[PDB]
Amino acid sequence: DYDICKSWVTTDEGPTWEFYACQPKVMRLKDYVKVKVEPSGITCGDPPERFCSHENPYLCSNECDASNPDLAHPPRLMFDKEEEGLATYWQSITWSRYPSPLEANITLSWNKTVELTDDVVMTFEYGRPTVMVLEKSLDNGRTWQPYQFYAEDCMEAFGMSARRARDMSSSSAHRVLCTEEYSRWAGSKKEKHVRFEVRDRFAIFAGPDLRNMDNLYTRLESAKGLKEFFTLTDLRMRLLRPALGGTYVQRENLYKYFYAISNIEVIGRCKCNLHANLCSMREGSLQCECEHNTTGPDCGKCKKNFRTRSWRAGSYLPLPHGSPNACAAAG
Ligand SMILES: *[C@@H]1O[C@H](CO)[C@@H](O[C@@H]2O[C@H](CO)[C@@H](O)[C@H](O)[C@H]2NC(C)=O)[C@H](O)[C@H]1NC(C)=O
Ligand SMILES: *[C@@H]1O[C@H](CO)[C@@H](O[C@@H]2O[C@H](CO)[C@@H](O)[C@H](O)[C@H]2NC(C)=O)[C@H](O)[C@H]1NC(C)=O
Ligand SMILES: [Ca+2]
Ligand SMILES: [Cl-]
Ligand SMILES: [Cl-]
């Protein structure tokens, strides 16, 4: 939708461009991400360390060794292409420091404003976390805010009630919530995925089958905060407690507790303020290819000779084609 920024047509005075509101295509945003995993030393394998392989097989004699490619689990394995039968994953050290918390931050950076268009799916291989917060930034990691909380027990963990995104109403579609859906029981079901529900929130407007896109586009234009809720320059997974298998920690086998993430899927498009339908790597980071006489990485300002009036974003409205709201040169 909103696929073309400009057309070359002929009116009298002859040939001229006509402009339309436009946006770039949805991308596999994990293919563009830069990752940081903290604190120092959290990645397994330096020094080599064994862990239990859910087999378990009671022995627990598998090894993570950062020095051997066959046995190493660096952060880039969270984003790779996987062939059938061969999940690859980042892996933390085991909880050998228990009762000290086992905590890891995974920061996902684009150095570019992007808009999610489907769920964020974070897939864990030996148990999802019992407690984690997904945070985002809109200013390249200068400030952070909570995006969704996750806990086996939302009250105990964060003083929050247990909710679900699909339970939110039109006025609460951008509300930050705590959910127990991906964390209560973690370690025992082998469900693997923790989600940040985007599609459920779009459904608040577009219906359960997402067929009423007209109403979602209208709300995205008009509801303050709605489009921004889906926008970010960075996400951070603040992992606070690993899977427990819905039972108490077995102190004599700390080798079964660890985080292992095989894939983080982030799907969405560059934010171009309805002024670009292409966004591409330039000077090492994504930037919109701005149309409508705009400029800046998100088409958020007017080009130097086109400053006769204030910059505006393009609009989705009126439906179906919206409005380009292009910058204007004098006269
Ligand atoms: C994960 O990221 C948060 C956010 O930066 C870290 O928070 C800092 O932690 C210490 C307490 O441990 C505070 O003194 C700082 O003020 C915190 N900064 C902020 C902005 O909150 C947290 O330490 C990180 N977790 C891990 C395990 O590294
Ligand atoms: C983040 O992205 C911006 C592009 O949007 C990069 O900014 C450019 O940096 C190059 C090389 O340093 C300069 O020649 C350009 O003039 C800069 N452009 C702008 C708009 O400032 C920036 O380096 C990237 N930052 C990081 C940390 O990767
Ligand atoms: Ca992988
Ligand atoms: Cl901009
Ligand atoms: Cl300027």
Interstrand relation of 285-288 and 49-51 (parallel, antiparallel or unpaired) = unpaired
| Same domain (yes/no): 189, 142 | yes
Distance 113 CA to ligand 4 centre (A): 9
| Same domain (yes/no): 167, 228 | yes
Q: In the Cβ-directed half-sphere of 234, how many Cα atoms lie within 13 Å?
A: 23
Single out the residue of 127, 201, 128, 190 nearest to residue 163, CA to CA.
201
For residue 38 and ligand 1, the question of a CB distance below 6 A is answered with yes
Domain-terminating residue out of 248, 270, 292:
270
CA atoms of 128 and 122, how far apart (whole Å) = 9
Cα 131 to chain centroid, rounded: 18
In 39-156, DSSP assigns E strands to 49-51, 62-64, 90-91, 104-116, 120-124, 131-137, 145-151
Distance 103 CA to ligand 1 centre (A): 11
CA atoms of 152 and 156, how far apart (whole Å) = 9
| Same domain (yes/no): 17, 105 | no
Alpha helices in 131-198 (DSSP H): 154-158
Pocket test for ligand 2, best of 234, 283, 288 (most atoms within 8 A of CB): 283
Neighbours of ion ligand 3 (CB under 5 A): 77, 80, 88, 262-263
Residue 130 · residue 242 · CB < 8 Å:
yes
| Same domain (yes/no): 169, 45 | yes
What is the chain's alpha carbon radius of gyration, rounded to the nearest angstrom?
23
* Nearest ligand 2 atom to alpha carbon 296: 20
Q: Hey, what amino acid is at 147?
A: Y
CA atoms of 117 and 263, how far apart (whole Å) = 18
SS3 241: strand
| Same domain (yes/no): 36, 125 | yes
Number of domains in the chain: 2
| Same domain (yes/no): 133, 249 | yes
Secondary element (H or E) of residue 195: strand 193-196
Helix, strand, coil shares, percent, the chain, to 5: 15, 30, 55
- φ and ψ at 315, to 5 degrees? -125, 145
| Same domain (yes/no): 112, 174 | yes
For residue 287 and ligand 2, the question of a CB distance below 6 A is answered with yes
CA dihedral 241, 116, 202, 153 (to 10 degrees): 10
Alpha helices in 61-198 (DSSP H): 154-158
Pocket test for ligand 2, best of 33, 107, 111 (most atoms within 8 A of CB): 111
| Same domain (yes/no): 162, 306 | no
| Same domain (yes/no): 284, 160 | no
The DSSP call for residue 315 is B
| Same domain (yes/no): 63, 162 | yes
For residue 140 and ligand 2, the question of a CB distance below 6 A is answered with no
For residue 297 and ligand 2, the question of a CB distance below 6 A is answered with yes
Distance 304 CA to ligand 5 centre (A): 7
| Same domain (yes/no): 37, 12 | no
Single out the residue of 263, 259, 264, 254 nearest to residue 239, CA to CA.
259
| Same domain (yes/no): 30, 175 | yes
Which residue's CA lies nearest to atom 18 of ligand 2?
A: 283
CATH number at residue 157: 2.60.120.260
CA atoms of 148 and 110, how far apart (whole Å) = 19
- Tell whether omega for the bond before 74 is within 30 degrees of 0, i.e. cis: no
For residue 105 and ligand 1, the question of a CB distance below 6 A is answered with yes
Q: Hey, what amino acid is at 316?
A: Y
In terms of residue numbers, what domain contains 150?
25-270
CATH number at residue 295: 2.10.25.10
Domain-terminating residue out of 229, 244, 270:
270
Q: Please report, in angstroms and rounded to a whole number, the separation of the first and last CA atoms in the chain.
A: 32
Domain-terminating residue out of 270, 287, 318:
270
Resolution of the entry in angstroms:
1.8
Distance 140 CA to ligand 4 centre (A): 13
Pocket test for ligand 1, best of 95, 105, 108, 241 (most atoms within 8 A of CB): 105
